[PDB]
Amino acid sequence: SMSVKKPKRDDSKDLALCSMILTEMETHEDAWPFLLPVNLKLVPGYKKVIKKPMDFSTIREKLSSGQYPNLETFALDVRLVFDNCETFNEDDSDIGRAGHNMRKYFEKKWTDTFKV
Distance CA 36, CA 9 (A): 33
Distance CA 11, CA 70 (A): 8
- The span of 1-9, 26-34, 56-64, 65-73 binding ligand IR5 (CB under 6 A) equals 26-34
In the set 21, 22, 33, 68, which binds ligand IR5 (CB under 6 A)? 33
| Residue list 77-116, contact with ligand IR5 (CB under 6 A) | 85, 88-89, 95
Question: Terminal CA-to-CA distance of the chain, rounded, Å?
Answer: 26
To 5 degrees, how large is the angle CA 41–CA 65–CA 27?
65
Cα–Cα distance for residue pair 5/78, rounded to 1 Å: 31
Closer residue to ligand IR5 (CB): 70 or 87: 87
Interaction of residue 38 with ligand IR5, rule CB under 6 A: yes
Footprint of ligand IR5 on this chain (CB under 6 A)? 32-34, 38-39, 42-43, 85, 88-89, 95
